[PDB]
Amino acid sequence: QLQARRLDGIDYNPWVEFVKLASEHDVVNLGQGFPDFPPPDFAVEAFQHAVSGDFMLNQYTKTFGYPPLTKILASFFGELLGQEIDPLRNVLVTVGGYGALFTAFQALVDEGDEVIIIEPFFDCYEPMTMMAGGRPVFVSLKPGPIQNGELGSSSNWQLDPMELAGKFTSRTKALVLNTPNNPLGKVFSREELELVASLCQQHDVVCITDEVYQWMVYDGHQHISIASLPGMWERTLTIGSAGKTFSATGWKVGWVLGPDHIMKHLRTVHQNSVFHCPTQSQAAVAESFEREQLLFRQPSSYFVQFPQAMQRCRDHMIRSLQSVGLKPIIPQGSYFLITDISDFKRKMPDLPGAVDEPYDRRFVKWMIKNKGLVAIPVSIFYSVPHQKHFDHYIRFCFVKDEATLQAMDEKLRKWKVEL
């Protein structure tokens, strides 16, 4: 073959097809995992300032990050983590959370290593492990049993201590923790994080912790960073995303925070891949964090206002989707909620599709074509052997304009009353 063997089995991109099918129908697109409204004015203004300020901002900045950005990341997150963070040794600016994840896998995961992944998982964790020669090892959150009185909560999806412990071996290099979780919206508790911490310390494993949804927490639930737990800083890489923080997904700026003895290897990958991140977006992100640090916990702060606003959008969507028999699982965080479609699988078992195509994928195509609503089938966030079991959930994104939620309700009205 022409191509490298590291690419085996990772060429299929579900997202390219998802975008394709939605674009051919008249839809309310609740599949897109980004806002369809503007970022806050201070963020847009920050980028405007960066592209109209010191003309030298048009030229290269420092390899490991624009210094004013690494300074504020170290200060702001050092406070939150209860850790002294050196900007030069403990911070790397990357091309989004995606680039940060990729850099961590390529630095640490080697042929034969195992990587523990928690289902449902942000889908790239599996192919990134594979491309680095690692063997993914899956542990499944166990859905809470639902009574048809009250809706389930993401919090009730359990990480079984015995099942998790049994996944660790001498070959475990890393465990990937995503909290708040996409697609499920689970916000991991202190007790759950202490379990993960205990096993990572026992087995000398690195925890790669994807915290992009840090600020998107609801119902009084608190984001806890595993790197803040005793002894965890020295074995944790913590990842963030400016796009998910400031509702500006197209900025594609992210970072990794961690101890020098691990970070040095990520710096090695960085300097031998992209070398620099763009200068001006970094300046915009630095200015945006400065604004939020100055207004920390205050009523006008984005980190106070925005999750409150999005909690209302969540509640609106939860009520609306029930009108057609979808069963939401209330998320404690993230942009997302999932709905159980088991009643549809029961009443409408035979949908067109390919052999061994999970029901949810077939259902989403049906719903797009017939009802004009887009969701993402949750089976894409499962290992292939588990897709036959976890085939009855779909993911919706509620971080949407009020007009979009109105349009959703119009589709639901038609679904209920027409034909």
Measured from the CB of residue 202, what is the shortest distance to Na ion in angstroms? 8
Query: Is position 33 annotated in a ligand binding site?
Result: yes
Q: How far apart are the first and last CA of the chain?
A: 53
Pairing of β 28-29 and β 373-374: parallel
> 3-class DSSP state for residue 413?
helix
**C-beta of 58 vs 222, nearer to a second copy:** 58
Query: Is position 89 annotated in a ligand binding site?
Result: no
**C-beta of 203 vs 345, nearer to Na ion:** 203
Measured from the CB of residue 269, what is the shortest distance to a second copy in angstroms? 7
Q: What is the largest CA-CA distance in the chain?
A: 63
Amino acid identity of residue 328, one-letter, is P
Residue 336: strand pairing partners: 397
Q: Report CA 116 to chain centroid distance, whole Å.
A: 17
A 10 A CB-CB count for 110 gives 11
Measured from the CB of residue 57, what is the shortest distance to a second copy in angstroms? 6
**C-beta of 122 vs 157, nearer to a second copy:** 122
**C-beta of 232 vs 253, nearer to a second copy:** 253
Size (the chain), residues: 419
248 binds, among a second copy, Na ion, none (CB under 5 to 8 A by kind): a second copy
How does DSSP assign 315-335, residue by residue? HHHHHHHGGGT-EEEB-SBSS
328 binds, among a second copy, Na ion, none (CB under 5 to 8 A by kind): none
Measured from the CB of residue 17, what is the shortest distance to a second copy in angstroms? 12
Measured from the CB of residue 274, what is the shortest distance to a second copy in angstroms? 5
17 binds, among a second copy, Na ion, none (CB under 5 to 8 A by kind): none
24-34 burial, b if ≥16 CB within 10 A, otherwise e? eeebbbbbbbe
Measured from the CB of residue 134, what is the shortest distance to Na ion in angstroms? 14
DSSP 144: P
For the chain, the C-alpha Rg in angstroms (whole number) is 21
- 241 contacts 96 by C-beta, under 8 angstroms: yes
203 binds, among a second copy, Na ion, none (CB under 5 to 8 A by kind): Na ion
Distance CA 129, CA 127 (A): 5
361 binds, among a second copy, Na ion, none (CB under 5 to 8 A by kind): none
**C-beta of 27 vs 141, nearer to a second copy:** 27
107 binds, among Na ion, a second copy, none (CB under 5 to 8 A by kind): a second copy
Tally helices (H) and strands (E) across the chain: 16, 13
**C-beta of 154 vs 281, nearer to a second copy:** 281
Query: Is position 152 annotated in a ligand binding site?
Result: no
277 binds, among a second copy, Na ion, none (CB under 5 to 8 A by kind): a second copy
**C-beta of 53 vs 231, nearer to Na ion:** 231
Measured from the CB of residue 39, what is the shortest distance to a second copy in angstroms? 5
Helix, strand, coil fractions of the chain, as percent rounded to 5: 45, 15, 40
**C-beta of 58 vs 169, nearer to a second copy:** 58
176-215 residues near Na ion, rule: CB under 5 A: 203-204
206 binds, among a second copy, Na ion, none (CB under 5 to 8 A by kind): a second copy
Number of residues that bind Na ion (CB under 5 A): 2
Distance CA 369, CA 25 (A): 7
Measured from the CB of residue 59, what is the shortest distance to a second copy in angstroms? 5
How does DSSP assign 37-72, residue by residue? SPPPHHHHHHHHHHHHS-GGGGS---TT--HHHHHH
Residues sharing a CB contact under 8 Å with residue 148, sequence separation 6 or more, in sequence order: none
> 3-class DSSP state for residue 401?
coil
Interface positions with Na ion (CB under 5 A): 203-204
Which residue positions form the known binding site for substrate?
33, 182, 395
- Sequence ranges of the binding site: 33, 182, 395
